[PDB]
Amino acid sequence: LLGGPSVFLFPPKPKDTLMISRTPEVTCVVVDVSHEDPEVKFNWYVDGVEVHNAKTKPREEQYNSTYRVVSVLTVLHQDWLNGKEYKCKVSNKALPAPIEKTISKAKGQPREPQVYTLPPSRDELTKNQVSLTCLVKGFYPSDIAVEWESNGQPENNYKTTPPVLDSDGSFFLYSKLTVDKSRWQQGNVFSCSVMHEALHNHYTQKSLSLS
Amino acid sequence: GPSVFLFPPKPKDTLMISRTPEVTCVVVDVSHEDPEVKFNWYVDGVEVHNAKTKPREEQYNSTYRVVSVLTVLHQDWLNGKEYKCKVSNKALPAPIEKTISKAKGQPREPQVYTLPPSRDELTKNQVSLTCLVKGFYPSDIAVEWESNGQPENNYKTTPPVLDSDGSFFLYSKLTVDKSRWQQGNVFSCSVMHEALHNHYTQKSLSLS
Ligand SMILES: *[C@@H]1O[C@H](CO[C@@H]2O[C@@H](C)[C@@H](O)[C@@H](O)[C@@H]2O)[C@@H](O[C@@H]2O[C@H](CO)[C@@H](O[C@@H]3O[C@H](CO[C@H]4O[C@H](CO)[C@@H](O)[C@H](O)[C@@H]4O[C@@H]4O[C@H](CO)[C@@H](O)[C@H](O)[C@H]4NC(C)=O)[C@@H](O)[C@H](O[C@H]4O[C@H](CO)[C@@H](O)[C@H](O)[C@@H]4O[C@@H]4O[C@H](CO)[C@@H](O)[C@H](O)[C@H]4NC(C)=O)[C@@H]3O)[C@H](O)[C@H]2NC(C)=O)[C@H](O)[C@H]1NC(C)=O
Ligand SMILES: *[C@@H]1O[C@H](CO[C@@H]2O[C@@H](C)[C@@H](O)[C@@H](O)[C@@H]2O)[C@@H](O[C@@H]2O[C@H](CO)[C@@H](O[C@@H]3O[C@H](CO[C@H]4O[C@H](CO)[C@@H](O)[C@H](O)[C@@H]4O[C@@H]4O[C@H](CO)[C@@H](O)[C@H](O)[C@H]4NC(C)=O)[C@@H](O)[C@H](O[C@H]4O[C@H](CO)[C@@H](O)[C@H](O)[C@@H]4O[C@@H]4O[C@H](CO)[C@@H](O)[C@H](O)[C@H]4NC(C)=O)[C@@H]3O)[C@H](O)[C@H]2NC(C)=O)[C@H](O)[C@H]1NC(C)=O
Ligand SMILES: [Zn+2]
Numbered sequence: 001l002l003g004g005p006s007v008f009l010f011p012p013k014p015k016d017t018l019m020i021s022r023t024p025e026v027t028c029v030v031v032d033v034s035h036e037d038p039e040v041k042f043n044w045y046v047d048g049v050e051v052h053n054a055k056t057k058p059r060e061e062q063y064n065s066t067y068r069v070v071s072v073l074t075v076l077h078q079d080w081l082n083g084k085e086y087k088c089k090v091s092n093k094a095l096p097a098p099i100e101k102t103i104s105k106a107k108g109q110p111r112e113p114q115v116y117t118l119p120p121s122r123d124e125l126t127k128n129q130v131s132l133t134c135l136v137k138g139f140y141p142s143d144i145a146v147e148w149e150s151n152g153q154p155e156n157n158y159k160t161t162p163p164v165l166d167s168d169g170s171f172f173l174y175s176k177l178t179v180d181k182s183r184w185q186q187g188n189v190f191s192c193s194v195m196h197e198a199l200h201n202h203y204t205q206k207s208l209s210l211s
Numbered sequence: 212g213p214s215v216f217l218f219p220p221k222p223k224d225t226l227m228i229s230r231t232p233e234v235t236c237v238v239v240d241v242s243h244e245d246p247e248v249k250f251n252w253y254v255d256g257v258e259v260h261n262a263k264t265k266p267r268e269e270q271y272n273s274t275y276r277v278v279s280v281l282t283v284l285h286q287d288w289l290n291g292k293e294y295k296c297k298v299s300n301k302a303l304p305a306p307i308e309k310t311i312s313k314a315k316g317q318p319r320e321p322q323v324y325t326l327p328p329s330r331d332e333l334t335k336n337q338v339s340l341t342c343l344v345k346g347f348y349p350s351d352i353a354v355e356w357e358s359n360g361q362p363e364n365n366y367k368t369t370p371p372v373l374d375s376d377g378s379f380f381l382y383s384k385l386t387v388d389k390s391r392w393q394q395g396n397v398f399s400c401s402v403m404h405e406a407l408h409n410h411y412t413q414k415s416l417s418l419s
Contacts, residue, residue: 116329118341123414124324131343133326135384161369161382174369174382176343206331 001065005032005040007090009101014143017080018195018202024080026073026103028088033059033067037094042071045087046079080105081197106141110198111170113139117192117208120184130181132208134192137172139163145195148177150188155179184210212302213241213248217294217309223353225288226403226410232288234281234311236296241267241275245301250279253295254287288313289405314349318406319378321347325400325416328392338389340416342400345380347371353403356385357413358396363387392418 008031012024030040044054056071073086083105091098113136120130136146142163148155157178163171175192189209195202216239220232238248252262261282268276279296291313299306321344328338344354350371356363365386371379383400397417403410 114332116332116339118326118329121324121326121343124322131324131345133341133343133382135329135339135341137339137384157375159372159374159380161372164367164369166367167365167386172367172384174341174343174384176345176380176382178375 001034001036001094003032005030005034005090005092005095005099007088007099007101009086009088009103011103011105011143012075012080013145015145015195017075017077017143018145018197020077024075024077026075026086026088028054028071028073028090028101029068030070030090030092030099031062031066031068033069033092034094035061035065035067037092038067038069039093040067040069041091043089043091043098044071044073045089046075046084048085048087083107105143108140108169111138111140112198113137113144113194113196113204115192115194115204115206117190117206119208119211125181128181129178130184132177132179132184132190132192134160134175134177134194134206134208135172136175136192136194137166138170139172139196139198140170141197142171143197144171144173146173146175147193147195148175148190149193150190155190186210212304213238213298213300213307215296215298215307215309217296217311219311219313219351220283220288221353222351223403225283225285225351226353226405228285232283232285234283234294234296236262236279236281236298236309238277238279238298238300239274241277241300242302243273243275246275246277247301248277249299251297251299251306252279252281253293253297254283255292256295291315313351316348318404319346319348320406321345321352321402321404321412323400323402323412323414325398325414327416327418333389336389337386338392340385340387340392340398342383342385342402342414342416343380344383344400344402345374346378347380347404347406348378349405350379351405352379352381354381354383355401356383357399357401363398395419 016024054073118133160175224232326341368383
């Protein structure tokens with residue numbers, strides 16, 4: 001067993017913090033836990049105050065002679081968005097000092113996304129499929145969710161870039177929805193929907209159809 | 212002990228014969244006691260000798276960073292040769308080897324579409340000019356903006372994104388004062404990619 005345990009601490013998904021009916025979680029994963037001595041303790045802290053409601057799962061033996069152990073802390077939506085810091089401490093007797101990782105929403109003043117839908121380029125109408133573009137810019141923090149739909153139903157064939165840092169410190173991204181050109185030319189309405197903390201009710205939709 | 216990371220040349224540098232593409236073998240966490248690192252480089256398993264080791268870069272965390280740089284032939288890289296860097300150091304029981312090469316597969320020509328600012332953005336002081344570059348392979352690409360022969364400073368480009376068909380797309384956003392858009396200035400999105408004729412294409416964007 002040459003080596004030592006490593007800790008990864010994962011944030012909630014952006015959609016989960018923004019919808020009260022969803023369940024946002026912070027997840028602490030410890031890997032390379034000693035095969036011979038796999039007992040691990042977790043301590044969790046929120047703004048440095050210890051909390052006791054995390055759910056720690058049974059350790060899972062890996063194929064490389066190590067264990068992996070996960071502890072899941074359900075967070076309050078408003079705690080996350082109000083910038084509370086979540087600390088996971090992991091102790092193990094084959095480890096000379098506990099390992100601590102901390103995570104929180106990115107620091108800074110939230111900024112409201114501007115959302116702009118862009119039709120296919122005229123050069124594109126040559127093709128059997130066209131691209132409908134959603135530009136979302138000016139937003140902060142980078143935690144965001146983007147989706148497309150038409151007639152109330154989610155569209156399958158879209159891809160969204162990661163947030164990119166802009167020159168003013170805000171973020172932008174684009175979402176591209178691919179549709180059969182026929183669907184565009186018939187005047188079907190498509191909608192880009194954006195979920196972000198700095199939108200009213202955390203959500204806005206911009207629509208797009210043939211002019 | 213030390214850790215090795217091997218980096219590919221810049222997309223622009225492999226596509227233009229006058230530019231100098233380099234593969235860079237970076238060694239971190241070399242101790243203060245043994246900054247001595249040896250480098251061997253191979254191209255499809257055959258030793259090459261043109262690598263240059265840059266002077267050791269001392270770091271805040273009590274280690275060195277040592278970099279070896281290998282100039283490559285544009286066509287070797289585009290033809291998919293494997294570049295192997297082997298690193299030997301006293302703090303390493305055995306040498307560490309890393310290999311890098313261009314992504315494998317039939318290259319595919321980027322389609323380049325310029326999109327004007329959304330009508331809703333026209334209430335702003337600055338507007339967004341969009342260049343959609345899609346259907347390309349491999350993901351290595353360079354994108355720049357120009358107007359009246361001259362580079363535009365104020366743009367950001369997304370990384371390549373894997374599309375549903377296994378090609379890549381990205382978007383480039385150039386921001387300009389609304390006045391310049393409204394005045395009929397012509398802006399151009401420049402794309403360099405191996406699958407393009409002469410490795411380069413441009414598309415213009417204007418109010419018109
Ligand atoms: C022995 O085996 C284990 C288990 O592996 C499994 O079994 C073996 C036998 C094989 O069969 C494996 O194929 C098999 O999977 C090995 O365990 C792995 O250990 C490595 C580290 O050595 C871990 O790598 C880290 O991975 C995370 C991302 O992890 C997510 O995504 C994985 C798929 O991409 C997925 O497999 C993971 O489970 C995990 O999934 C996420 O799970 C959360 C919680 O459940 C969930 O909510 C998410 O939705 C889900 N995500 C996805 C995509 O599914 C990665 O983040 C780590 O990167 C950080 O650390 C690096 C340094 O270690 C660094 O280089 C990176 O840049 C990055 O750094 C962080 O970056 C952020 C932002 O930039 C920054 O804020 C942070 O500060 C910074 N972190 C710091 C402080 O360093 C990292 O790459 C694997 O997750 C882990 N696998 C599993 C399954 O647990 C083990 O290595 C083997 N041991 C030996 C000796 O060989
Ligand atoms: C002591 O200090 C030094 C110096 O650190 C610097 O200063 C300190 C004070 C801090 O501020 C640091 O944050 C800061 O970096 C430390 O050295 C660092 O060591 C880490 C690992 O511990 C390295 O991490 C790797 O980074 C590469 C990316 O590296 C580029 O980007 C960085 C900025 O994002 C940049 O700082 C780097 O210099 C480098 O920049 C590039 O340089 C080349 C060459 O010149 C140039 O051509 C490029 O243009 C330039 N790019 C730029 C500017 O962006 C990252 O890719 C590595 O990830 C791989 O490996 C991880 C394992 O550690 C793994 O988790 C990842 O998933 C990923 O895995 C690989 O992925 C590839 C494809 O994705 C895949 O094929 C492989 O399977 C897989 N390989 C595996 C598993 O190994 C990795 O994160 C830092 O680069 C390095 N910093 C510098 C400047 O060298 C040192 O660690 C400190 N030690 C301590 C704490 O004691
Ligand atoms: Zn064992």
